Amino acid sequence: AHKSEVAHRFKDLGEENFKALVLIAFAQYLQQCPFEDHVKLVNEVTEFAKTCVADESAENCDKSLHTLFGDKLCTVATLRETYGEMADCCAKQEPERNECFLQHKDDNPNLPRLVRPEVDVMCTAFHDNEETFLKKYLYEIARRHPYFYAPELLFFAKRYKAAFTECCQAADKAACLLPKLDELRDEGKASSAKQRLKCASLQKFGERAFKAWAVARLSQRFPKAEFAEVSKLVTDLTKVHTECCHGDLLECADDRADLAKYICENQDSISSKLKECCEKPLLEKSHCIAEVENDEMPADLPSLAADFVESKDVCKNYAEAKDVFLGMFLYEYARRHPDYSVVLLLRLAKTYETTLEKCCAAADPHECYAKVFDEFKPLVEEPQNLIKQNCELFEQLGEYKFQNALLVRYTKKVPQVSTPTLVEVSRNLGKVGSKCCKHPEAKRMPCAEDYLSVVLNQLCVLHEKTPVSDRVTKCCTESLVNRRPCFSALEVDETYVPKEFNAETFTFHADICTLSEKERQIKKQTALVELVKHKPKATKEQLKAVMDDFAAFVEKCCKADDKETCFAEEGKKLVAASQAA
Numbered sequence: 001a002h003k004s005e006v007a008h009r010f011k012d013l014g015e016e017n018f019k020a021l022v023l024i025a026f027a028q029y030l031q032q033c034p035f036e037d038h039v040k041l042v043n044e045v046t047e048f049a050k051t052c053v054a055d056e057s058a059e060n061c062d063k064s065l066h067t068l069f070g071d072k073l074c075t076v077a078t079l080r081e082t083y084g085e086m087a088d089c090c091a092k093q094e095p096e097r098n099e100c101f102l103q104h105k106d107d108n109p110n111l112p113r114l115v116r117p118e119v120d121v122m123c124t125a126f127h128d129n130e131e132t133f134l135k136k137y138l139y140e141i142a143r144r145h146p147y148f149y150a151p152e153l154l155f156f157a158k159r160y161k162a163a164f165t166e167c168c169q170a171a172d173k174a175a176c177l178l179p180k181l182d183e184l185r186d187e188g189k190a191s192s193a194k195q196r197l198k199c200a201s202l203q204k205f206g207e208r209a210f211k212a213w214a215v216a217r218l219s220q221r222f223p224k225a226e227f228a229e230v231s232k233l234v235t236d237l238t239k240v241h242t243e244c245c246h247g248d249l250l251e252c253a254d255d256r257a258d259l260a261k262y263i264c265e266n267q268d269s270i271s272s273k274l275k276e277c278c279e280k281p282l283l284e285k286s287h288c289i290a291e292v293e294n295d296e297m298p299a300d301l302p303s304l305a306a307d308f309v310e311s312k313d314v315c316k317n318y319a320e321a322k323d324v325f326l327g328m329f330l331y332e333y334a335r336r337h338p339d340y341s342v343v344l345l346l347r348l349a350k351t352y353e354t355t356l357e358k359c360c361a362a363a364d365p366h367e368c369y370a371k372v373f374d375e376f377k378p379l380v381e382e383p384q385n386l387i388k389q390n391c392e393l394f395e396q397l398g399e400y401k402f403q404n405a406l407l408v409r410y411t412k413k414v415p416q417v418s419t420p421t422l423v424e425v426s427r428n429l430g431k432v433g434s435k436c437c438k439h440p441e442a443k444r445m446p447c448a449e450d451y452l453s454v455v456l457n458q459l460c461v462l463h464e465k466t467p468v469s470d471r472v473t474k475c476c477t478e479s480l481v482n483r484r485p486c487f488s489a490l491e492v493d494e495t496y497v498p499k500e501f502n503a504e505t506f507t508f509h510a511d512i513c514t515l516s517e518k519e520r521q522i523k524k525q526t527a528l529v530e531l532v533k534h535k536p537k538a539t540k541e542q543l544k545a546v547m548d549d550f551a552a553f554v555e556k557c558c559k560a561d562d563k564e565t566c567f568a569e570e571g572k573k574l575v576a577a578s579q580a581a
């Protein structure tokens with residue numbers, strides 16, 4: 001164990017990443033804090049760190065990272081008149097102060113939306129103070145996505161700098177810059193959502209859950225790798241994400257680097273597909289390994305019949321070490337099925353487990369578990385059916401109309417759920433259609449069913465903040481593996497009383513003419529959820545009818561005699577038809 005963890009981390013990560021990482025740590029705890037303040041605090045922490053690196057025996061160098069950093073956040077956070085319910089945390093010591101900070105993370109911060117300035121402007125600000133410009137990027141995303149995988153956020157910042165470096169010297173700056181930022185925005189939302197799930201698993205379902213998940217995913221990725229190796233990897237990788245989720249961002253970054261290093265110094269025993277990745281700079285390398293394509297599986301692997309049903313020691317080995325035996329089954333099953341979703345593999349693993357508990361406590365266990373594998377079959381076919389059906393539906397509806405289809409279906413299921421949430425979740429689910437139906441009906445399952453998990457988790461966590469439907473609460477709390485079926489099983493809420501008619505939520509304005517097409521869509525899908533809430537018995541024929549009116553008048557009013565008052569009479573037409581009763 002090192003004396004002075006801050007020195008140890010400062011030396012290991014180096015100054016630039018140390019600062020960026022603390023800045024992320026601060027913004028993911030204090031999302032409402034202004035930029036300038038966080039930087040000042042990070043600067044002071046970094047000032048102090050250097051003293052400990054110089055001399056580890058100097059005054060506070062032996063304090064934990066959280067004590068040191070926590071004391072530092074609270075200088076601005078103790079302000080109750082500006083931050084409210086967050087010096088709740090500052091009244092505490094470590095570790096309870098940190099436990100407090102983690103539980104006050106807000107998945108939906110009431111934060112001002114980003115202005116996006118002219119390209120001229122951004123590029124000016126970039127050359128002027130390159131370092132501030134990047135911090136301002138780190139800060140904005142971190143406070144908006146308090147679960148962004150911090151090391152990966154350094155990677156994003158780096159791509160972000162790279163974009164401005166390249167495009168700000170381009171002949172056409174806009175034509176170069178914007179697609180890169182558009183890709184970066186999408187890739188970032190995806191990354192954030194994926195990490196929320198890794199964190200929710202750990203924090204709500206425990207380390208054992210995350211491990212099973214990783215064994216499964218890594219086994220599919222590295223099918224030539226031995227179990228001992230995968231287990232080692234699962235271990236390191238869990239230690240890393242546990243750290244990140246628990247707010248130990250420096251150790252997380254460090255331990256992820258060590259890992260990325262291990263992987264590359266052991267390529268020949270992991271995968272044949274890491275060659276290019278391990279030639280990249282640190283951030284890029286680590287990212288590349290993380291998203292690397294599955295290796296080819298060894299040819300002619302045997303069947304699992306021998307070890308997991310036919311051996312005489314199935315019950316012994318099970319009872320002799322249940323977790324490593326299940327890990328093995330899960331490893332052996334996942335290696336051989338990169339075409340199964342990670343969730344399917346966990347279900348089969350869970351089925352095999354529950355089947356051994358029942359059968360090892362039986363007269364003749366082998367006679368009892370002989371069937372087991374046959375029982376996996378309807379579990380495998382079930383996701384296949386849904387994906388087949390949803391992809392046909394998407395193929396004839398397109399992303400947008402497909403999202404609206406989900407918007408209506410999902411609103412009727414759980415109309416207490418908040419409108420912006422319904423809109424976000426349904427729009428994202430629509431993105432499975434685009435991302436996954438694209439693939440041949442044979443790689444679709446991991447893409448489709450693993451991504452829904454990420455999307456269903458967003459719903460779960462956005463709903464957790466201010467819960468309004470016990471049925472969502474139940475599906476989200478029940479298991480993690482049963483989330484999709486539990487949500488699929490939900491029936492239309494006939495118990496729910498229709499919302500009254502608010503005029504403003506159905507009146508539009510001249511500002512809508514200045515929005516992107518995407519925003520306009522979002523604007524209208526927002527109206528649609530509100531429509532269903534106000535008339536849940538409306539028909540598909542009726543709903544899509546009222547839809548095209550919204551569509552048509554936007555067109556006519558964005559052109560007409562003063563666009564502002566134009567949305568207004570349409571507001572007056574709808575208002576009069578409601579008072580009418």
Ligand SMILES: COc1cc([C@@H]2c3cc4c(cc3[C@@H](O[C@@H]3O[C@@H]5CO[C@@H](c6cccs6)O[C@H]5[C@H](O)[C@H]3O)[C@H]3COC(=O)[C@H]23)OCO4)cc(OC)c1O
Binds near residue numbers: 115117134137141182
């Ligand atoms: C991870 O990827 C994501 C990126 C973003 C957005 C985002 C989205 C974009 C974009 C730029 C930006 C940047 O926005 C700019 O951030 C700047 C940071 O740099 C500094 C400034 C320099 C000089 C004055 S301010 O200015 C800021 C701009 O105002 C702002 O638009 C990101 C920086 O931090 C964000 O949050 C921002 O071009 C078109 O699409 C949002 C996400 O979800 C909401 C997300 O997941």
